[PDB]
């Protein structure tokens, strides 16, 4: 891989490993020293190949002094061949070894100028050569990465209509690297359900019929779901350890909108206490989908009426400390045509009620828990980072690894998936505009506190490990959150002497302020910091960014196929309205209410595709791109990895004793960033 060119400085250039990293164009390189610049030297003449490391002997016509910058220029040879430059190092005449991190695509469009890898705050740069580069870099970043309102009331996002319009730096490594159109269809072929992709009018004949298709493609967990999805235990299990375990909260008093009585649920209670007394003991929990109330159902297919509920599900921590459903009201306003279903009802009344709650859980999962609260939020942090933090800034170096491909995957999504007439309209009952309504309404109550994991759990009354023992999403989440809190606190303490340095960092303040004003639209009730004025506050802020982008997203993303592939346990749509009376529903009707073959197929394709890890996935703590090069921060990273390794073992041992292991938050399965 290593090609040395001998005719001074020794200039090493490392090309990227990506498919199209190589270039065959001319590469000129000059050195900017305190005592003066150098000449523009052409390099190689040949080709810089994928994975290559080329070094050169470069003799200069005058003494340059200490090297401050390195300029790179790509002039065309034949056609335009993009070039991914990982980094450049120098062995100077005086024997110094200097590394210049890059990790950028170099299209001929403009000269690329690099700092040496030591992270510097603005206050560290007092000479004109550095200050000018720093200021000019931010000017360029702010012309290149702009905010834009994609839909009314959304967090602001990148100013680009489609993926190819993005700056090359933040695009996927290929144009079809991660593609919703391509990956969904390929998914459907590998699941052998390709023939169903347009059967939007054909119901399954029965559960045996869908099951015929499903046994061929089930995995460990979804097969468990196939065999146990009708059980109250599995139903309640998912609110804690399923694909979307963030909605349930301890009920401190029954809502007036749910007129449920002790008599109605006496058969479920097991401590000889009334329902009301049970609530006061802290044994009653609730999942309430008031958000779905008023959301427009998908009408893009005039031949299929699709339907949404907005249920209130009451649950109960029984004597075995398992949480189970004891009552379900499918809509918000109590009444005669809005029955409170119970486990003591006819078999299929209770089953269908649970199916509607599972379907509602799915809608809120897709759009709010997943899209808004990890994807869109992570893009807000990413854009603000690019706009306000130069590459030499320690916080840029820290965060860039954790917003990798985030803007790219989100732009792909707005281009193909969630736009008008996107893939999302095919199977989802909220498709066609409802999902946009959900984001707008959830946005009004998206807060900074709700992204702080420990507080969020506490706010939902689910913090007690003693009272609520089997909340594995909570337990593991807390371990990983604390591991990140530890790592960010350490990095902050290295580069910030005190709280006053944090407060006076104008680029940090502008980063935080962009997130607040543009990202979060300047809504006062968002609770986001307008500024950050202590190392402790900065540490927490950075943990919010990193945790949301890695752990939180992993928790709510990679369990989609496990739990949703068996469709009756996560219907993306319902083709009949919720039952208004008891004693009417039949199993045949349920099969016709569940999604047809066409929507089942697009649903399966989607949840499989989104749950895949890429071959060379970068998991939490893996930083192959060395933006940081200093010993102290490198050791902080090493401690981060060891701390994470310990968590992997804690979680593994914990899982050996579980009927159904929970591993979405095992750090070795948590990607660095939102990339799918």
Which residue ranges make up the site for Fe ion (CB under 5 A)?
557
Nearest to 191 by CA among 615, 574, 607, 592: 607
For residues 545-557, b (16+ Cβ closer than 10 Å) or e, as one string? bbbbbbbbbbbbb
| Closest distance to Fe ion from the beta carbon of 186 (Å) | 18
Whichever of 80 and 614 has its CB closer to Fe ion, that residue is 614
| Closest distance to Fe ion from the beta carbon of 545 (Å) | 16
Which positions ≥6 away from 162 have C-beta within 8 Å?
A: 411, 415
Whichever of 549 and 636 has its CB closer to Fe ion, that residue is 549
Alpha helix segments (H runs only) across 244-389 = 262-265, 275-281, 347-364, 377-388
Q: How far apart are the C-alpha atoms of 197 and 528, rounded to whole Å?
A: 44
Question: How would DSSP label each residue in 216-260?
Answer: TT--HHHHHHHHHTTSHHHHHHHHHHSS-TTS-EE-SS--TT---
**Which uninterrupted H or E stretch holds 41?**
strand 41-43
Whichever of 557 and 666 has its CB closer to Fe ion, that residue is 557
Q: Take residue 215 and report the two structure tokens written for it.
A: 């046994």
Residue found by looking up tokens 């803007």 in the block: 407
| Closest distance to Fe ion from the beta carbon of 371 (Å) | 8
Whichever of 101 and 382 has its CB closer to Fe ion, that residue is 382
| Closest distance to Fe ion from the beta carbon of 413 (Å) | 9
Q: How far apart are the C-alpha atoms of 202 and 600, rounded to whole Å?
A: 11
Whichever of 246 and 590 has its CB closer to Fe ion, that residue is 246
Decide if 144 contacts 653 (C-beta within 8 A).
no
Whichever of 283 and 557 has its CB closer to Fe ion, that residue is 557
| Closest distance to Fe ion from the beta carbon of 674 (Å) | 6
Whichever of 238 and 557 has its CB closer to Fe ion, that residue is 557
Classify 545 as helix, strand or coil. helix
| Closest distance to Fe ion from the beta carbon of 189 (Å) | 22
Decide if 142 contacts 158 (C-beta within 8 A).
no
| Closest distance to Fe ion from the beta carbon of 406 (Å) | 10
Classify 407 as helix, strand or coil. helix
Classify 671 as helix, strand or coil. strand
Could you tell me how many residues make up the chain?
Answer: 676
Which positions ≥6 away from 209 have C-beta within 8 Å?
A: none
| Closest distance to Fe ion from the beta carbon of 196 (Å) | 25
Q: How many beta carbons lie within 10 A of that of residue 568, not counting itself?
A: 20
Whichever of 372 and 462 has its CB closer to Fe ion, that residue is 372
Q: How many beta carbons lie within 10 A of that of residue 21, not counting itself?
A: 21
Strands 112-115 vs 36-37: parallel, antiparallel or unpaired: unpaired
Whichever of 489 and 555 has its CB closer to Fe ion, that residue is 555
Residue found by looking up tokens 């006062």 in the block: 524
| Closest distance to Fe ion from the beta carbon of 192 (Å) | 25
Residue nearest to Fe ion (CB): 557
Q: How many beta carbons lie within 10 A of that of residue 296, not counting itself?
A: 16
**Which uninterrupted H or E stretch holds 324?**
strand 323-329
| Closest distance to Fe ion from the beta carbon of 436 (Å) | 18
Whichever of 543 and 557 has its CB closer to Fe ion, that residue is 557
Q: How far apart are the C-alpha atoms of 255 and 259, rounded to whole Å?
A: 8
Nearest to 101 by CA among 70, 56, 135: 70
| Closest distance to Fe ion from the beta carbon of 615 (Å) | 18
| Closest distance to Fe ion from the beta carbon of 457 (Å) | 22
Whichever of 22 and 671 has its CB closer to Fe ion, that residue is 671
């Amino acid at each position: 891989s290593s090609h040395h060119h001998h005719h001074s400085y020794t200039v090493t250039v490392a090309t990227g490993s990506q498919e199209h990293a190589g270039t065959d164009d001319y590469i000129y390189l000059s050195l900017v020293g305190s005592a003066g610049c150098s000449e523009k030297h052409l390099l190689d003449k040949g080709s810089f190949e994928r994975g290559a490391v080329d070094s050169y002997d470069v003799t200069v016509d005058e003494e340059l002094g200490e090297i401050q910058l390195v300029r790179i220029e790509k002039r065309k040879y034949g056609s335009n061949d993009d070039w991914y430059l990982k980094y450049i190092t120098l062995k100077t005449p005086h024997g110094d070894y200097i590394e210049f991190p890059c990790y950028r695509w170099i299209t001929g469009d403009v000269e690329v100028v690099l700092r040496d890898g030591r992270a510097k705050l603005a206050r560290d740069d007092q000479i004109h050569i550095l200050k000018q580069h720093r200021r000019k870099e931010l000017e360029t970043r702010q012309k290149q990465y702009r905010w834009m309102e994609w839909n009314p009331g959304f967090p602001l996002s990148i100013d680009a209509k489609c993926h190819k319009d993005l700056p090359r730096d933040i695009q996927f490594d290929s144009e079809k690297g991660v593609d919703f159109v391509l990956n969904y269809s390929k998914a459907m072929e590998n699941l052998f359900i390709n023939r169903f992709m347009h059967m939007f009018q054909s119901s399954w004949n029965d559960f045996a019929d869908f099951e015929k298709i499903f046994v061929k493609i089930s995995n460990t967990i979804s097969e468990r779901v196939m065999n146990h999805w009708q059980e109250d235990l599995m139903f309640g299990y998912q609110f804690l350890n399923g694909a979307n375990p963030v909605l349930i909260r301890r009920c401190t008093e029954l809502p007036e909108k749910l007129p449920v009585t002790t008599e109605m649920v006496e058969c479920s209670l097991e401590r000889q206490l009334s329902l009301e007394q049970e609530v006061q003991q802290g044994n009653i929990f609730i999942v309430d989908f008031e958000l779905l109330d008023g959301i427009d159902a998908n009408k893009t297919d005039p031949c299929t009426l699709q339907f949404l509920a907005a249920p209130i599900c009451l649950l109960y921590k029984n004597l075995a400390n398992k949480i189970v459903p004891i009552a379900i009201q499918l809509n918000q306003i109590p009444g005669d045509e809005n029955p409170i279903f119970l486990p003591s009802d006819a078999k299929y009344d209770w089953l269908l009620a649970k199916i509607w709650v599972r379907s509602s859980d799915f809608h809120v999962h897709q759009t709010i828990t997943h899209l808004l609260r990890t994807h869109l939020v992570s893009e807000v942090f990413g854009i603000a980072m690019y706009r306000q933090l130069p590459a030499v800034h320690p916080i840029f170096k820290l965060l860039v690894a954790h917003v990798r491909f985030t803007i790219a995957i989100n732009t792909k999504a707005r281009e193909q998936l969630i736009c008008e007439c996107g893939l999302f309209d095919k199977a989802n009952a909220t498709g066609g505009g409802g999902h946009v309504q959900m984001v707008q309404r959830a946005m009004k109550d998206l807060t900074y506190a709700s992204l702080c994991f420990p507080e969020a759990i506490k706010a939902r009354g689910m913090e007690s490990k003693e009272d609520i023992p089997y909340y594995f999403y909570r337990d593991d989440g807390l371990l990983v959150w604390e591991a990140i809190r530890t790592f960010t606190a350490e990095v902050v303490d290295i580069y910030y002497e005190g709280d006053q340095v944090v407060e006076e960092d104008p680029e940090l303040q502008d980063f935080v302020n962009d997130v607040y004003v543009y990202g979060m639209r300047g809504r006062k009730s968002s609770g986001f910091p307008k500024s950050v004025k202590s190392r402790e506050q900065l540490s927490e802020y950075l943990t919010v960014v990193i945790f949301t982008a890695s752990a939180q997203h992993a928790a709510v993303n990679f369990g989609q196929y496990d739990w949703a592939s068996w469709i009756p346990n996560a219907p993306p749509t319902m083709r009949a309205p919720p039952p208004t009376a008891k004693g009417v529903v039949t199993i045949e009707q349920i099969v016709d209410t569940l999604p047809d073959r066409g929507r089942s197929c697009w649903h399966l394709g989607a949840v499989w595709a989104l749950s895949q890890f890429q071959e060379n996935e970068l998991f939490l703590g893996m930083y192959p791109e060395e933006h940081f090069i200093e010993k102290p921060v490198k050791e902080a990273m090493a401690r981060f990895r060891k701390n994470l390794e310990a968590i992997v073992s804690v979680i593994a041992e914990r899982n050996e004793n579980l009927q159904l292991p929970y591993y979405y938050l095992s750090p070795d399965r948590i990607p660095n960033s939102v990339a799918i």
